[PDB]
């Protein structure tokens, strides 16, 4: 019959998603591996 009938909803689907994170993404890990010589196998180092 005549009238205004509600059928369904419609949402605006989201487009491409993004993620944002801060600056200062660093410590010098090279100073551990770019050491010129390594020590004796009885002097293992924990460069914390």
């Amino acid at each position, epitope marked *: 019959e005549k009238g205004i009938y509600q059928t369904s909803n419609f949402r605006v689907q989201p487009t491409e998603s993004i993620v944002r994170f801060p600056n200062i993404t660093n410590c010098p890990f090279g*100073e551990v591996f770019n050491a010129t010589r390594f020590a004796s196998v009885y002097a293992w180092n924990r460069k914390r």
Partner: nanobody
Amino acid sequence: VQLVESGGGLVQPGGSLRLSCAASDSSFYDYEMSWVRQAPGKAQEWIGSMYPSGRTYINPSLKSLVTISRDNSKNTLYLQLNSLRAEDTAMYYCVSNWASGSTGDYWGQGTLVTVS
């Protein structure tokens, strides 16, 4: 100045020589103080080592050529050179912590040595 070196000079082939290094305090020698040489052309190598456990074990290749002793009155450290040939040009630095890689060694100025 807290560490110095004394002795050394021209080496007549077949002659004897005296060399030394010093430190500042008794805690500075604690726990390890090991001799070391360097050399232009020839690879750097450690001369002698005195471990803090009382047992001294020099390198199997360098344990039958160098005599090592310590004197804390001057903090001096006797070192002697014997029978250098034309193939052993070495320049001597007194650098600690060589059994810790290149992350614990202390670099200063040292002295320059030429052996003809």
